[PDB]
Every structure is written in C-alpha cells, then in structure tokens.
Design a protein around this ligand. Structure first.
Ligand SMILES: [Mg+2]
Ligand SMILES: [Mg+2]
Ligand SMILES: [Mg+2]
Ligand SMILES: [Mg+2]
Ligand SMILES: [Mg+2]
Ligand SMILES: [Mg+2]
Ligand SMILES: [Mg+2]
Ligand SMILES: [Mg+2]
Ligand SMILES: [Mg+2]
Ligand SMILES: [Mg+2]
Ligand SMILES: [Mg+2]
Ligand SMILES: [Mg+2]
Ligand SMILES: [Mg+2]
Ligand SMILES: [Mg+2]
Ligand SMILES: [Mg+2]
Ligand SMILES: [Mg+2]
Ligand SMILES: [Mg+2]
Lengths: 58, 203, 86, 233, 125, 45, 34, 154
RNA sequence: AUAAUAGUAAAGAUGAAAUAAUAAUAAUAAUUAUAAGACUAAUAUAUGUGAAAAUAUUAAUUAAAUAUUAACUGACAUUGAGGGAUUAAAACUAGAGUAGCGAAACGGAUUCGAUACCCGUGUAGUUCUAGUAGUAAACUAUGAAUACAAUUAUUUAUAAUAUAUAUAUAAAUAAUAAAUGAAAAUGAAAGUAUUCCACCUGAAGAGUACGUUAGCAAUAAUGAAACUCAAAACAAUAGACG
C-alpha cells in the first residue's frame, strides 16, 4: 500500500515540477510577448521601420 | 559446447554485412570480405558456405552477403579485385604517411573510424630500395590518363612541366588506350579512407 | 470563475512562483506586471479550450466523491466522472 | 505437410503381410529394422537455455524478485501487460545465437577496411585437431588476421590481465600491427634479394593489371565507335 | 489558445509598400489586446508576388506583402478577428490556424519551427 | 517515504541473508518467522 | 440465388408492379368510403 | 468453472493435433485437479506449476503478487506416431449441466446410453465432479458419489 | 449564359448523317469582362476513420477516438426476444435554387419495324433548408463475444539497444501447414471449443391474397391457403460454342 501511495504521489509531483518549469520558461520568454499598446507599437516599429530580417526564401 | 565451436568457426569469423554487392557510387576501400577457395575445392563446387556454388563460376575468389536467402540462392559476386589493388599498391612501394603532423596510429568507448590506413599498407616510410642498377630514387609506374590518371588500381592526381600536345590532342578522349609512365611523389590518406596519390607524367 | 487557470495551474501558486523567481533574480516593475498579466491571459480558462474546463470539472467531481485520496475507480466516483461528460 | 504414418511403420505393414501369407519370404531389411526401431515421435520439443549466451528462456522475473525502485523511481507492485501474456512461442522457436566476438569482428573490419581484401578460405580443416594457446597471436595452422586479434582479446578478458574489454582489444590490435609490419618487410626484402641475385619475374602485378585493363579498353573502343556511328545515323 | 495568422495585405503605393500592412498589423494587434489576447510575435515576410492574379471585390492583385501574427486569444475572439480580416478591403488572403498547446506552452511560428527553432526561447538565444 | 520504503526492504534482505542473526533479532524483539520479522521491521520504522 | 434464378423473381416483381399500375383506379375506388 | 475447463480441453486437443510436447493451462483448482487426474490415468507425461512464460524449476509460493501471471504446465504424450490424448470432449456443458446418481453412472459404465451420453469406451476416461473433487467415474461408483459428469478423454 | 473586341464562312454532331435557342441579324475558334449555380485534379491506397449507411479542396469551433505506464474499482461481464436509434439511391410535402446532367415528352437518325441502343431540345429530378419514409447485390452474399493452434514475407506502432543499428513485442495485409469442407476454397476462420441471439426445412403458387398496424403518398412491415409437379438447387468435370 505504502509503495502504491508513493508511486501515485511521485508521478503527480513530477508533473507539478514540469508545469512549474514550463511556467518559468514562459515567464523568461514573456518580455517579447505583448499586452499593452505601446509595446505593440514598438514591436511594429522593429518589424517594419528597420527594413531588416523580412522572412523571404532563396 | 557446439555453440562455442560455431562462434569460433570460419563462417562466424566473416563479419556480417548487408551492403550492396553492386555499388555504383564512389569506392574508396573494400566493402566485403574476399573469400577464396583452393582449386580442388572449386572443382567439387565447395566454398565453405551453406550450399554448393554454381559450376558456372570458375574464379577461385568471391564476395557474399547471405549464406541463403528466401530466393533459395546465396547472394554473391564472383570477384576479388580489392586484393589485387592492395598488391599493386605494395609493388609500387610508396609508403602512406599522414600529411598532417600526427603520430603513426599503429604505435603507442570504441572508435569506428579508420585507424590510420585501413591495412592496405603496413610499410614504414624510412626505407630505400636497392637494385642491380642502383638505389631507386624515383618510383617508375605505368598508368593511363583519363582526360587524373589510373595508376595500378588507384586513380591519382597528376602534374607535369609542360602539357604534351602530340600525345593528348591526337586522341583527345582515347587517352586511356596509351599507357604512360609515371613518377609517384607521395601517398596521403584522408578521413574518408580514400588514398590520395600524386603522380608526375614522364616522357 | 474570474481568475481560474487551465493546464492544472492555480492562480495563488503562480503569483508565489513569480515572486520567488523575482527574488532569485534580485539575489543573482511595470514590465514585470505586464509579463505576469500576459502569462495569466495565456493560462486563463476563458482563452483556453472547453476540454480543459471539462477536465477541471471531472477532477473536482473526483475530489468530492473519492472515499479516500488514492481511489479513482470507486463506482460512485466513476458515476460522477460520467455525469460531467454527459 | 501432414505427419506421414507410412514411412516409419514399414516393418508392421510387412509383418502383417507375412502373417497373412501375401509375403512368402521375408525381406533382407526386416530383422534389421526390427532390431533398430525408427523414432516415430515427431514432436515440437521446448528449449530452456540459449546455448550461445546461456540466458534462461523459461523463467519470469516476479514483483517480489524486483523489490527496489525502477528507472524513473517507481516501485513495481503489479504484473505488467507482458507478464500476463502466455509466452509459450519463446520456448519453442529456436534461439538467436549471439556472441560478444561478432561485435568485435564488426568493429575491426570497420577500423581496417583493407583487411577485407585479404582472402579468406572458409573450407574448414579438422576443427577438433587444433590447439591454440592465445597467450600469443601467431598460431601455426591459423593465419594472421582480425580473428586472431579477437581470440587474443577474449583470452585477455578471460585471464583478467586487462579487466576491461576495450583495453584488451587495443592490446591485441597493437600486437597484430607489429606482426603485419614484419610480414610487410619480409616480402619487400625477399623481392630485393631476388632482384639482386638475378631472379627474373616475367609479369609483375601492376604489369598484369595494365594488360587486363588493355583488353577491356580495346573491347570498349570498337563498341564505342559503333555507338558513335549509330548516333550519327 | 495560440492561433497563428497569415495575412497577404494589399500594396497600392509603389514607393512605400509596407504602410498598409503595418496599419493592418497595428489594428488587429490592438483588437487582440483589447480582447483578453496576447500577440507573441509579428513575423514579417517579403513583398512576394502572388502565384496568380488574385482578385478581391472590384479589384485585382499580382503582388502583396505577407506576414505572420502569432497570437493567443479565445476561440470566439479569433473567429471574429478572422471575420474582420475577411471584411476589410486591404487584405487579399487571410488564414488563421491553430497551434496546439497540449504538450508545450512556448511554441514559435510555423516558419521558425520549419527552420529548426521549436520554442521562441531558441529564437531569442 | 522513499527512504522509509528502502530501509524496511534493506533490513529484511539482511535478515534473510543471515540465519543465526535472524533468530537473535527475533529473541531481542520478543514463513511465519519471516512475517514476524517483517512486522518487527515495520514497527521499528 | 444465381442470376438465372433471380431473373424469375425479377420477372414476378415486374408483373406485380404492372398489376398494381393497372389496378390503381380500381384500388382507389375500393379504398375511399368503405 | 466449466467454460474454462472446455477451453483447456480444446487447447489440449489443438496441441495434440500439431504435436507440441509441453503446454500451458490456466492455474485454478478445478483445472489443476483435472490435470492431476489425467496424469494419474496416464494421458500427461508431466504436470507442474509455473509462470506465464514457462514451467518453474524451484518452488515459488503463489500470492496476489503472482496469481495473475501463474500457470499450469503440462507435458503431452505420444507413442508409435499417435498421440495418447486424442480427445477432450466435455459432457456437462455450461448450458446443459448434467448430474447423475450412482445408478446412472454404473449404467453408463456398463454400456447404456443415458441422458444422451454415449456410454464410456474401452480406453476412455469419464471424469466426475463430486463435492468439488474430480474423480474417475469408476472411482465415484466405488465410493458411491452422486456427481456431475464433467468430461471425457480418449 | 450575357456583353465587347477584332476577325471570316461555315460551325456543331456522328459509325455516317441530319434535327435543333447554330450561323451572312456575322457564328464557331480566339481574347477580354460580368454573373450563376453545382462539383472538388493530383496526393489516393477508401490506406485509414466510422455501428453500419458512409467518409478524400482549406480553415476554425464543439464532440468522440490510440498505445504504454501509475493508481483505483472488485466480475460491475457476454449475448440480447420485445424495444430504441441511425440507415445509400429513388420517391414524397413544404420554401428557396436550378449552371451542368437528365427519367418523361417531342423531334432527328438507325432499322423490315425501333414505343430502343446514337444525336438534339430538354420537364420532374439531381442542390440547399425543414421534414416523411425505413428499404438496396444495405455484400465479406460470412451475426456478436471469449479461449486456443504450425510457418513465412511485408508494412505500421511500441519498448529496449550502443540519434541508426540489429533485437524483442503487438496490429494489420499477403502467401500457406494443419484442420475443415459437396468442392470452389476458408486459414487465425469456413479450424479446435464454449456462450448468446437471428434464421432455414422440396419446387411452383408467394413475400402473392386476405387481415392488421404505420405512412401525405408511393409503399413498409406482418403473412397464409387451395391448386400442380418429382422435381428443384450448388461445387466441380469434359466437351461444344462465342
Ligand atoms: Mg442462399
Ligand atoms: Mg459490424
Ligand atoms: Mg481527389
Ligand atoms: Mg449488445
Ligand atoms: Mg455512394
Ligand atoms: Mg431525394
Ligand atoms: Mg421539391
Ligand atoms: Mg436524350
Ligand atoms: Mg427518421
Ligand atoms: Mg422493397
Ligand atoms: Mg432486405
Ligand atoms: Mg454500400
Ligand atoms: Mg491441406
Ligand atoms: Mg466443423
Ligand atoms: Mg487464401
Ligand atoms: Mg388472413
Ligand atoms: Mg408489403
């Protein structure tokens, strides 16, 4: 029974750890992500006004 | 036990492979273990394989993949050209040395890459070869120009003082017919296991 | 409910985790708040699929009915799990 | 193919004939076949050991026999799916014979491609007669090859001079190399000697090769000219 | 829910082609953010010629400016974004398509994944 | 929990290994014999 | 049923259909009001 | 159970047909008893407990940890190009289970068709369950046990 | 289909021909430009997926779906009369829609005749929305479930191996052994066994009549008897024939 309880709990813990890691990764990323208007405008300027790194293949 | 004997025995000794017997790509070294018979054993069609081999084969050497297949025939090819290339190379007597400044691998988890040469030459570079006429400085070998030159079972890069027009331009793409002499300078060996010879055309 | 999250997350726990990360970074504001908001939006129920919501409901039902924490096949809990799907 | 009753029950069928009087005289084979009976028991017999390895076929590792935690730290408390399936076909299908030496052989010829070009006679001489002490590589009846190396490696492993397999293999390889170099030097010097003392070789190997190429080229040329003519027309 | 977008915008002005595209990107991004959404990346693509002379209502187009917007939203929000795209006269072809987050959370655009970079972390680094 | 699981098993294995030791351990405490040993181990941990 | 055997059945079915077509007005008369 | 018994009989027949030597059976009490009865009459060469993978060399006690993977290995028997255990037809089928008194069993033994059973044959063995113990029908008669006529091997 | 452009006498059709909303009112072909419906080239193997009908242009939404592990439940299962739901094509009732195709009808051929096969106009119909109805060679002409039995080759997925090798599993597909079978052949079932349901008992008459129920209807289900024969049917064989 004890062994079975451990097995049940260990997997859950691992899953929790994975979820936390994923969250951490998302947080690390999220400086690039946009919510506000000003950030969106800045992103647009970076993309369009620079005239650099247009994804076109050759 | 029987199992131990089987593991020891001469068919177990031939390391298995399912590489093509017909490979039209670039051949830099032997693909398959060459297998010879004696003349007596050939006469009664026995090669030391699972089955008898067809009486049509009169060559003593061959190469194989499968002892027996679903088609009820051993997958073989009656040819052992690779031994003759090695023997030609030995005759030429140009010792293979690594052009890169490195120690000779034969002196002192697993690495599948080719340890120095593949074993076509265990010759050492420091020797001279005397004869009645004297000590041979320049190794004279006959070869054929293709367009590169075929020199004793190896293709080799070639150089000369002046490009001779009389021999070349008379027969532009039948240069393979006429055998020319060559002075082999040195033989280097690359990572892929290709022997990169370098010759010089003599006239 | 308003600050409920998908993907087996909990909003209180997420905030605490973010705070811990911040503390670790300091050891080794507006922007940080914006990032946190973005994360919440990503992990919110209302932006996620219905499937996640159903899964959450099933989990809740299981928690309610389980005659002990380990059991998930309890005839009653099975029935409860069926009900949410139904 | 059904199990034939009538190939092995020959003496019984003849004994009946003899009893009847259909046969007046007994065959020559009759007494002999009576003395030495056929098998007549055409069974599928199960096998419990792989002979090459010495692995056990029949047994099943239990839950109680695996007390400690698994990879990914989970304790086995139940039989898995495969532990419930009735593995009878494994007892009957003949075992795939595996050897440690096969891997070494494969490695050697990868490392030494041109060792494949050394021709190999597979027609065995008396396997019982041989008696090789693998203290050294050079055995008498056997030639020098990758096999001899591998045998040396195995001997080293057995004796525990080199506890590790890889080190033993390397050592065997290094023993081989020196011998090969010596062999190479022997032939060259013998050739030199022959040249010095007025020996005459009519056809050298390279000359032979050139001659062989020449015939093929001649065959090609006539054909190629015909093909060019065809193309023109 | 991470939805990728591909809009092929109009380019009326010869000298300054990207302006209409930029405006479109602004507007749709604004919509997304007003509506609980989170635009992750706005990958530009080149002024690429169309395969055929593609035509909107009472117009014709042979060249267009292409871009990907890789945003999060609800399903209803996305559907409505799609509708607005369909409605507007300054886009030729529009296409929203889902990016599945059952396994991962960080997922780059389709182009970036094809190149090699699975997550946006890889792109950043 | 994992450490607890380990300790019970390792002790039991040790008990199984040594027969003379096992009887002495049982006396100190106070198939059937094996079960009793296991129970004692559980009580200890 | 082989095809040959089926053909008798088919023929029967056709005849029945024909009979029904013939006796449409009669059937109608019989059906209504009784 | 009786369905199980029928399945094992069918399996035995199949194995006799193709000439396998050593055959697995499910590990139950009734099944074990049946196998033991066959062994004693002389239809099986061997009978031994074991895993799902093979027969066991040493003793292994059967518990909830093992029970699902446990199995009853059984050696089959052949002589002069003919299998010993030719047939394994059962009599009491799951749907029409038949229970004879001692008199009926005696009659069966002495060549009388009863309840549509062909009476038992020269080299045959009718097994009989009586208070959860499988016996020969002759043995049951001797002991005087009114029992379920289980099955029939030849 | 309509319109414009320029352009010239045939065009379209067929076995060969004609009739026609064809063409000297300027067509057909060509190039443009509008509109309208309905269909979905390759990939494709219906591989696969679906209970079966079905199901291959793209996207989104919601639903359902595989395997292996971990834990839990503790025989809760199988089959299933009656019953229930879904059920191609045609058909029907409404309201839209109607390009192409196309029962019928009319016309031209063909033919001794031609209520046909071919050609031309082409209405119902085919399309959508809401329903009715519950049948098809609705077929694998093979009800569902479980246990079991000898090989090989193909793929597919799973695990280990020291990511690309040779291995162990399953799953399907294709050849078979045995076994079964009237044979054709079936081949993990048409084999060995167990369980449950449906159904058959000579051919005609007949899935007809009468009756009942259901339907807007066409019809669907249910389903007799008299009368009359020693017939009637299947697998395979050898011919003759095309
Ligand atoms: Mg029939
Ligand atoms: Mg079905
Ligand atoms: Mg298609
Ligand atoms: Mg059912
Ligand atoms: Mg269809
Ligand atoms: Mg219809
Ligand atoms: Mg209508
Ligand atoms: Mg018509
Ligand atoms: Mg309906
Ligand atoms: Mg009908
Ligand atoms: Mg029907
Ligand atoms: Mg169909
Ligand atoms: Mg057969
Ligand atoms: Mg049968
Ligand atoms: Mg077949
Ligand atoms: Mg009636
Ligand atoms: Mg009817």
């Amino acid at each position: 029974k004890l062994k079975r309880n451990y097995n049940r709990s260990l997997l859950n813990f691992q899953a929790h750890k994975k979820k936390l890691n994923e969250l951490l990764n998302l947080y690390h990323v999220a400086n690039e992500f946009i919510v506000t208007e000003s950030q969106l405008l800045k992103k647009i300027d970076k993309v369009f006004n620079d005239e650099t790194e247009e994804f076109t293949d050759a | 036990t029987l199992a131990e004997l089987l593991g020891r025995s001469r068919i177990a000794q031939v390391a298995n492979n399912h590489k093509p017997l017909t490979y039209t790509g670039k051949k830099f070294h032997p693909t398959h273990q060459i297998i010879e018979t004696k003349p007596s054993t050939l006469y009664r069609q026995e090669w030391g394989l699972k089955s008898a081999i067809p009486s049509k084969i009169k060559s003593r050497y061959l190469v194989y993949n499968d002892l027996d297949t679903l088609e009820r025939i051993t997958t073989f090819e009656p040819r052992g050209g690779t031994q003759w290339n090695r023997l030609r190379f030995q005759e030429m007597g140009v010792p293979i040395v690594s052009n890169i400044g490195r120690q000779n691998p034969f002196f002192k988890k697993f690495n599948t890459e080719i340890i120095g040469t593949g074993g076509l030459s265990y010759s050492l570079p420091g020797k001279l070869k005397n004869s009645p006429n004297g000590v041979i400085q320049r190794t004279v070998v006959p070869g054929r120009i293709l367009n590169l030159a075929a020199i004793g079972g190896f293709v080799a890069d070639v150089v000369f003082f002046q490009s001779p027009p009389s021999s070349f331009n008379s027969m532009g793409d039948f240069i393979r017919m006429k055998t020319f002499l060559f002075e082999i300078l040195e033989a280097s060996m690359e990572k892929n296991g290709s022997v990169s010879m370098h010759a010089r055309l003599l006239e | 409910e308003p600050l409920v999250l998908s993907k087996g997350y909990n909003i209180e726990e997420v905030d605490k985790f973010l705070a811990a990360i911040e503390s670790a970074k300091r050891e080794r504001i507006e922007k940080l708040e914006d990032r946190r908001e973005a994360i919440l939006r990503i992990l919110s129920m209302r932006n996620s699929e219905n499937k996640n919501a159903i899964k959450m409901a099933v989990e809740l039902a299981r928690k309610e009915f389980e005659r002990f924490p380990g059991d998930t096949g309890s005839s009653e809990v099975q029935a409860a799990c069926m009900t949410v799907r139904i | 193919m059904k199990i034939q009753t009538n190939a092995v029950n020959v003496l019984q069928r003849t004994s009946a004939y003899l009893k009847s009087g259909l046969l007046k005289e007994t065959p020559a084979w009759y007494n002999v076949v009576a003395s030495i009976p056929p098998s007549t028991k055409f069974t599928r017999e199960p096998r419990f050991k792989n002979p090459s390895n010495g692995h056990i076929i029949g047994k099943l590792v239990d839950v109680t026999e695996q007390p400690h935690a698994n990879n990914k730290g989970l304790y086995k408390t139940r039989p898995n799916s495969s532990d419930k399936r009735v593995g009878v076909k494994r007892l009957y299908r003949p075992p795939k014979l595996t050897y440690v030496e096969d891997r070494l052989r494969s490695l050697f010829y990868k490392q030494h491609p041109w060792e494949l070009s050394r021709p190999k006679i597979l027609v065995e001489n008396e396997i019982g007669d041989e008696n090789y002490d693998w203290s050294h590589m050079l055995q008498i009846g056997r030639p020098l090859d990758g096999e001899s190396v591998i045998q040396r490696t195995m001997y080293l492993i057995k004796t525990k001079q080199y506890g590790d397999m890889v080190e033993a293999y390397d050592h065997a390889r290094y023993e081989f190399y020196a011998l090969r170099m010596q062999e190479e030097t022997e032939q060259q010097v013998a050739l030199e000697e022959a040249e010095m003392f007025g020996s005459l070789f009519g056809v050298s190997a390279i000359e032979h090769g050139i001659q062989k190429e020449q015939e093929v080229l001649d065959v090609w040329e006539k054909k190629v000219v015909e093909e060019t003519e065809l193309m023109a027309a | 829910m991470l939805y990728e977008l591909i809009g092929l915008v109009r380019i009326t002005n010869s000298n300054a082609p990207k302006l209409e595209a930029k405006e479109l990107s602004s507007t749709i991004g604004k919509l997304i953010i007003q509506n609980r959404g989170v635009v992750r990346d706005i990958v530009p693509m080149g002024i690429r010629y169309l395969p055929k002379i593609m035509k909107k209502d009472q117009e014709k187009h042979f060249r267009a400016y292409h871009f990907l917007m890789l945003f999060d939203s609800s399903a209803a929000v996305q559907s409505e974004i799609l509708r607005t795209l369909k409605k507007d006269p300054r886009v030729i072809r529009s296409s929203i398509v889902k990016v599945d987050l059952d396994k991962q959370l960080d997922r780059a655009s389709s182009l970036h994944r094809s190149l090699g970079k699975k997550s946006i972390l890889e792109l950043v680094n | 929990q994992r450490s607890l699981i380990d300790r019970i098993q390792t002790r039991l294995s040790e008990l199984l290994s040594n027969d003379l030791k096992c009887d002495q351990f049982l006396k100190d405490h106070g198939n059937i014999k094996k079960n009793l040993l296991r129970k004692h181990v559980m009580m200890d941990m | 049923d082989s095809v040959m055997r089926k053909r008798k059945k088919k023929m029967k079915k056709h005849k029945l259909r024909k009979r029904r077509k013939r006796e449409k007005a009669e059937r109608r008369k019989l059906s209504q009001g009784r | 159970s009786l369905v199980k018994l029928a399945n094992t009989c069918a399996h035995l027949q199949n194995c006799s047909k193709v000439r396998v030597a050593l055959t697995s059976i499910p590990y139950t009490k009734l099944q074990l008893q049946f196998a033991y009865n066959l062994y004693q009459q002389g239809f099986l060469s061997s009978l031994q407990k074991g895993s799902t993978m093979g027969p066991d060399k040493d003793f292994v006690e059967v518990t909830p940890d093992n029970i699902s993977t446990r199995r009853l290995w059984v050696g089959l028997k052949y002589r002069d190009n003919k299998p010993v255990l030719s047939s394994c037809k059962l009599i009491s089928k799951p749907n029409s289970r038949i229970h004879l008194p001692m008199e009926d069993m005696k009659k069966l033994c002495s060549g009388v068709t009863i309840r549509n059973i062909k009476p038992l044959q020269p080299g045959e063995l009718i097994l009989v369950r009586a208070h959860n113990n499988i016996m020969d029908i002759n043995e049951a008669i001797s002991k005087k046990l009114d029992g379920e006529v289980l099955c029939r091997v030849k």
